[PDB]
Nucleic acid binder design. Sequence first.
RNA 1: AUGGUUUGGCACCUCGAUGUCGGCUCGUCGCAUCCUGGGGCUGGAGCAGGUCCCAAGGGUUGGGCUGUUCGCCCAUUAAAGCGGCACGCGAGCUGGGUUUAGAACGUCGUGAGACAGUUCGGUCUCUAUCCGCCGCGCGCGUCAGAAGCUUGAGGAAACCUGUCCCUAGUACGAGAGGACCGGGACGGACGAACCUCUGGUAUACCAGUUGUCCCACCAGGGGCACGGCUGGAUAGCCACGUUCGGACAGGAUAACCGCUGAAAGCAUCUAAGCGGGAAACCUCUUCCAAGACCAGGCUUCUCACCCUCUAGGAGGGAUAAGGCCCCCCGCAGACCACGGGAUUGAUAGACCAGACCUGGAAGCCUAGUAAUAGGUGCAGGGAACUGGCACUAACCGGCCGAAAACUUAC
Lengths: 118, 113, 54, 122, 214
Amino acid sequence: PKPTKGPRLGGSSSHQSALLANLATSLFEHGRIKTTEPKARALRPYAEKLITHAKKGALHNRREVMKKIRDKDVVHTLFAEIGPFYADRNGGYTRIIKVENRKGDNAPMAVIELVREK
Amino acid sequence: MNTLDFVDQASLRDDIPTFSPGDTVNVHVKVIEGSKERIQVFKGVVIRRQGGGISETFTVRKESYGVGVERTFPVHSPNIDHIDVLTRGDVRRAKLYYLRELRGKKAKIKEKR
Amino acid sequence: AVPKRRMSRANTRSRRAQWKAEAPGLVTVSVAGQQRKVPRRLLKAARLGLVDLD
Amino acid sequence: MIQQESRLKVADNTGAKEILCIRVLGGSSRRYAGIGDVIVATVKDAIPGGNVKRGDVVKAVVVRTVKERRRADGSYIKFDENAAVIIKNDNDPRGTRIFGPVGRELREKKFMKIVSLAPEVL
Amino acid sequence: ARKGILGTKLGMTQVFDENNKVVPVTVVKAGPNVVTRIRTTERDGYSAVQLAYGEISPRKVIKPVAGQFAAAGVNPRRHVAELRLDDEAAVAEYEVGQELTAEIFSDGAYVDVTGTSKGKGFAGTMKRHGFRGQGAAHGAQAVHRRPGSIGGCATPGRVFKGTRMSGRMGNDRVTTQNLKVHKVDAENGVLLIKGAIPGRNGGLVVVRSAIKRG
RNA sequence: AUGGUUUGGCACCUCGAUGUCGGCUCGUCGCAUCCUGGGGCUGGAGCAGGUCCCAAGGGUUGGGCUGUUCGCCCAUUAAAGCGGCACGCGAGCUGGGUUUAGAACGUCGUGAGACAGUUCGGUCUCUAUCCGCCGCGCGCGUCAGAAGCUUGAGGAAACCUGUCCCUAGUACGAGAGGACCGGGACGGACGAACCUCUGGUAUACCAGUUGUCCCACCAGGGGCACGGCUGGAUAGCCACGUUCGGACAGGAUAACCGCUGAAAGCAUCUAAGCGGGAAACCUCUUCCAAGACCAGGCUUCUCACCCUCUAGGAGGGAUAAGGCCCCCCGCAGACCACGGGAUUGAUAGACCAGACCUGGAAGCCUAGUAAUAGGUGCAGGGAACUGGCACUAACCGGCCGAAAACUUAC
């Protein structure tokens, strides 16, 4: 999606890519994760586009997802439940909730979770 | 929807033959030589095409008298009376800038068969 | 560069007065029945029970 | 775009092979010379039997450039090499034969003899 | 006298004239303008006409602006601006409620476009003032872009108000003069102005008749 | 006779420290003016000069040699001005020279050593307190609280110039040569705005490919090796790109040209007067600007409800118009601010479609012993741009915020 306007998240572009991949993997595996607010803000489009790939479930899309997720159990869950679950929803798969700041460095924490309403 | 499209379409020019980089075309360009009209044909290889709609431009490169010549034309330019596509080239790139360093035998292009 | 002179009390206090903290704005919320103050930034989180409230 | 200390191949048959630009005539502190500009140049390489000699200060006009040059009708022209033709004070070539194509800009600058002698004008 | 209109910068495109030359033209949405207030010498001390432009929902206007528009007699508009005329005979042809559109201009007319320049942020002297930086080699130590000398040797011992140094750049009202109107698209209310006008796409611009070439 | 721009003289100034020349970067001022501008006489026929007045608005090039200032030279140019400001500018830069310690040559001294004689090499430290300057906010004020649009005292920016074509090969001139004035086009340097074109960049784009490890394996991919290296690369920023600018006009003037005429019966551009007269001056162009304390003007909106001490004023509370904070954001941005949206919503993301970039995806089939090639197929993949779409987030929300009175005139 849209690249970050400012400097990268983890201090380098490769670290940022690995960070986004790991965060997306954790979000798909658990269903909700807690992280600093900018991290979730950057994670939203990445996870939503991965879910969009998972929605139209074909071998091509499976390879497209696997070239970013790298975790096979999470890929199987994504293409078995998460994919079909959002079949009739057009966008807005995730939501961001702002929570209390961190104690060590006063970083703004936020919780990003998949929607389960319908 | 490309907001300036309604302005663009009025000056857009039809009848442009379809072509791709690598094709060999001859461009019939009208010129002015002491206030009289004549058409000078420029025959060469289409090495690039930068899509912009009305501002779409294509480049044709020819080897003339041992000196390489490149000419860039707007596709919808009224100064171009007619474009004729002679042969279809087989290329793997959208821009043939590597042809600027090749001469003669090495600078030939495969023909689409 | 080094300071050429010792700063007087007036200038020191006047510039020191600008180092201060602003009071965050609090709005009420109803969780588990009892009413308590929570910043409006955390209103939704408090309503979903994501904020530890002592 | 040709400037000071730039080298140009010679596109005529005066015996010179390569010249070095000294000044770009046509205004004080002028910077670049495109197709059709007159420059002051010194001959760096010359044919052993040619009439010109190395180090001769001459007057030449640029006829080819590598940097593409915009035209009035929105089209561009780009050559492969920078080339110049040695001329006299009356804007005629000191040679009798021109090698390689030239630009249309030599017509609006009243270089009729060079245009006529050129093998082709683009 | 000097005509004018409020418009919006839509973008820039390319057109070919009747000599087949290329003409880079900026598209200006010179939309419908409504006269809201008339400035007169007998009341305000100067002669000017006030124009309104843009569309906004009626629930977005505050009570004072809505009251002013209602007193004028027209629906509120997003943008309001004044055109300074020269005398009362110049303002005699404008009355409140009259609608101004793009066809007040004609092909080949010369116009002056006023807009807010793009923002460049806190810009250094190399960018803000065209300073030539110091050498990038030959031992120069951390002075590749700094301005260098400021004053000199005591005497005034001060810095001479108006010294050019780094600071905020852009975001200032700018007027470009003697722009030629290539075409007036009446049905879209669109002006094709040859050249570049200040501001970003979608910004507010004021198109006025040229003061030098008109 | 001026000047302290040159070498001088004095030593009042600092040895419990004032960087010593050139160069770079950045200036500001004077006119004793290099060009452009206005005139006079010409030992000025015209051209072109000579010379002298007025004139400081702008401009006043790039290189070779030398550490150089200076200077000579090479190309140009309208011209390549002279000077002041610690011979401006090292808490801005350089260390080439000078000016430590090493070493050598010539000369001097028996010797240690020495030479405003020569040559090679030789640490340039600092987090900005105050004034100053460039930008940005907070607070209060402008006699109720606010909101739109502005007038402008005052200030800043800009001010350059060339060639060619008609008038005209005329005037003048033995001929050669050679115009005044007025119109038009194209340029050089500089400045601003902008990204349609060209070009640069491109750390979440597309494709190729090397070494290696991993996804059990083939296939297909992934991590690392400067984004591993290459070929392209939309948006944004930008110039090498595009467009535009220096004006026109008026007033008062300088040198000067004058009209009308005294003192001084004539004369006299003058002591009364009245006129022309320049890139200088005031307007004119662009921009800032009511903290302009004379704190402005035209409008519009709310235009009210309590409690307390003692009723003199004051204090406190709650409000209206409106603003801010929290939230979604920006091509606005260090922070702040500014601008837009906030369910009565297209502000951002996602989704769908298009534009554009890349260049023909995976799987399957076919041909080939294989490398590989063809079909399915303008395929697949994808960021900025455009249009739809409330699916996600802009929230069942907090803080501020409206009137002593009197005099005179009508």
